[PDB]
Amino acid sequence: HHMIIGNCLILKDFSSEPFWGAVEIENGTIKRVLQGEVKVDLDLSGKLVMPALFNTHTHAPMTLLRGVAEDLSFEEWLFSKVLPIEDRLTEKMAYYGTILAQMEMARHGIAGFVDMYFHEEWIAKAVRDFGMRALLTRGLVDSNGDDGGRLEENLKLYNEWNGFEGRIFVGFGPHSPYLCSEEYLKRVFDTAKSLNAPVTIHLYETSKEEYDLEDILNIGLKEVKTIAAHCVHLPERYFGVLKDIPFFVSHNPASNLKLGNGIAPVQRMIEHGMKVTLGTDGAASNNSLNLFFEMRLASLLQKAQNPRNLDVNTCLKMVTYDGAQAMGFKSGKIEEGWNADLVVIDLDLPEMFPVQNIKNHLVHAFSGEVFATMVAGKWIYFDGEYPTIDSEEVKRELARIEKELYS
Ligand code: NI
């Protein structure tokens, strides 16, 4: 309803420096940003307050598959290991697996995530209950136009959850241009275009994908907001026409290395004006859902080519503001009228010294373990605890689920 937190360093956005102050929050939004010492309800002196993070690509229930598919090529990973397990993944498991995904993500300062999966209504219930924001999409695939009812399920999800509490939006999730036929992909973009909804898709993830992007550009990509995960093998000849359309790349560095796909040319894309964001992918191919780790790794991989690549401000912009923009939320900046999606970082740690270079440490030294995360003016993680759920009951159900799923 109404509070003032702070009396500590505040980092308003990716482009500025920390200043001592406080933040006034009312009804899930930032009412005022104060400078200097002021009377506050929650004193966080010795800490840093900054905008929360936004993960643009994940499959939340895959936390239940963390570490089950190691040392395999992508085709083996998907058809030999993953699919047989997904066949046994229940609605209840989707729910708890995403409560677990949120518990992990909140510890890393994430306020919202884009999901592409199944049993999405149960995933939505977990997001509702836990407190994060989410752009939820149903994974879509077909065989000659027969999608087994997947788009219909995505439409039911949209009917029931789109817009929920200003926290959940629904989009459509065709898996990729190779698991979706051309006619069906056109049908999906047509649907998203009619509903003014976004589309997310795995695009040029592997080197085997050599289709022309004109095919997709001609069926809706220019008019539908699209979060294209990976883009590792996206041909450079297309960078120029991808700049002025609502096309957002979701860069998933750890997954790309782990599955032997390589390194996306993020620096060249940004140089051509493309919008780039960061995603973690699922827990079976990353293995963590930590966007600070993804951001740091992304910076390092581009620096391998030139140490001046992906500077600190650009990295901080991608994980906060850019990701919130891809998801359609007014977050990413501690400014009057913006969402109260904030993160609290402990500065009394060895890796946060010298104090003079805190922003640099956030990108190149910080553990990624935040002190607290707030979404829509509500604490969803605070000093090791999860105020919105019964952690012990969740732990007991997850232990039962591990036995049940892997007998
Ligand atoms: Ni993925």
The owner of tokens 């397990």 is 85
Ligand 1 centroid, distance to 177 Cα (angstroms): 13
CA dihedral 126, 129, 134, 140 (to 10 degrees): 30
Separation between Cα atoms, residue 403 and residue 400, nearest integer Å:
5
Task: Indicate the SS3 state at residue 166.
Answer: helix
From the CA of 59, how far away is ligand 1's center (Å)? 6
Question: Which region, left, alpha or beta, applies to residue 165 given φ > 0 means left and ψ of -120 to 50 means alpha?
Answer: left
Q: How many residues does the chain have?
A: 407
344 in helix, strand or coil?
strand
How many of the other CB atoms lie within 10 Å of CB of 139? 22
> Is-contact 280 286, C-beta < 8 A?
yes
- Partnered with residue 228 across adjacent β-strands are 201, 249
How many CA atoms lie within 13 Å of 129's alpha carbon, on the beta-carbon side? 18
CA 202 – ligand 1 centroid, Å: 6
Beta carbons of 33 and 305 less than 8 angstroms apart: no
327, two tokens? 């998801």
The answer for 262, left when phi > 0, alpha when psi is -120 to 50, beta otherwise, is: left
Peptide bond into 354 cis (omega under 30): yes
Q: Which amino acid is at 385?
A: E
- Provide DSSP, 362-394: HHHT--S--SEEEETTEEEEETTB-TTS-HHHH
User: What is the rounded radius of gyration, in angstroms, for the C-alpha atoms of the chain?
Assistant: 20
For residues 318-350, b (16+ Cβ closer than 10 Å) or e, as one string?
A: bbbbbbbbbbebebbbbeeebbbbbbbbbbeee
Centre of ligand 1 from the C-alpha of residue 282, in Å = 6
**Residue 175 is labelled as binding a ligand:** yes
Structure tokens, 290: 């930590």
Q: Helices 120-130 & 150-161, crossing angle to 10 degrees?
A: 30
Contact 104, 61 (CB under 8 A): no
Distance 155 CA to ligand 1 centre (A): 21
User: Please, are residues 289 and 259 in contact by the beta-carbon 8 Å criterion?
Assistant: no
Measured from the Cβ of residue 124, the count of other Cβ atoms closer than 10 Å reads 24
Q: Does 26 show up as a binding residue in the annotation?
A: no
Q: Would the annotation count 202 as a binding residue?
A: yes
User: What are 45's two structure tokens?
Assistant: 């002196």
Angle ∠(224,227,228) on CA atoms, nearest 5? 110
With H, G, I as helix, E, B as strand and everything else as coil, classify residue 20: strand
| Per-residue DSSP letter, 177 | T
Write the DSSP assignment of 184-231 as a string of letters: HHHHHHHHHHHHT--EEEEES-STT----THHHIIIIITTS-EEEEE-
**99 Cα to the center of ligand 1, angstroms:** 19
Give the bridge partners for 3, in sequence order.
25
Q: What angle do CA 109, 113, 115 make, to 5 degrees?
A: 150
Q: Map out the domains of the chain with their CATH numbers.
A: 1-51+333-386 (2.30.40.10), 52-332 (3.20.20.140)
Q: Does 119 show up as a binding residue in the annotation?
A: no
What tokens were used for 4? 């003032």
In angstroms, the CA 93 to CA 108 distance is 23
Type of residue numbered 345: I
Write the CA distances from 405 to 70, 95, 126, integer angstroms.
18, 14, 19
The answer to whether 150 is annotated as binding is yes
Nearest Cα to Cα of residue 229 among 294, 273, 159: 294
- Is 205 annotated to bind ligand? yes
Element (H, E) at 302: helix 291-303
Q: Which is nearest to 26 in space by CA: 37, 41, 39?
A: 41
Read off φ and ψ for residue 344, nearest 5 degrees.
-115, 125
Compute the C-alpha angle 239/242/246, nearest 5°. Answer: 155
Distance between CA atoms of 141 and 145, rounded to whole angstroms?
9
With contact defined as beta carbons under 8 Å apart, do 65 and 85 qualify? yes
Q: Residue 34 has which token pair?
A: 């104060």
305-311 LR contacts (CB < 8 Å, sep 24+): 305/267, 306/267, 309/267, 310/266, 310/267, 310/270
Instruction: Please name the residue that has the structure tokens 């997850």.
Output: 398
* DSSP tag of 165: G
Enter the resolution in angstroms: 1.9
Q: 108 alpha carbon to ligand 1 midpoint, in Å?
A: 19
- CB contact set of 363 (below 8 Å; sequence gap of 6+): 295, 296, 299, 312, 315, 316
Distances in Å between the Cα of 269 and the Cα atoms of 225, 277, 291, 300, 395 are 18, 11, 20, 16, 42
**CA 175 / ligand 1 centre spacing (Å):** 8
Phi/psi region, residue 193 (left: phi>0; alpha: psi -120 to 50; beta: rest), is alpha
59 is in an annotated binding site: yes
CA of 128 to the centre of ligand 1 (A): 22
What is the DSSP secondary-structure string of 59-120?
-GGGGGGTTSS-S--HHIIIIIIIHHHHTT--HHHHHHHHHHHHHHHHTTTEEEEEEEESSH
Judge contact between 173 and 201, C-beta under 8 A. Answer: yes
AA identity, residue 372: A
d(CA 396, CA 85): 21
Closest CA to 176 of 123, 212, 139, 207: 139
Asked if residue 230 lies in contact with residue 253, where contact means CB atoms within 8 angstroms, the answer is no
DSSP state of 318: I
Longest Cα–Cα distance of the chain, Å, equals: 65
Listed residue (242, 256, 249) closest to 318, CA to CA: 249
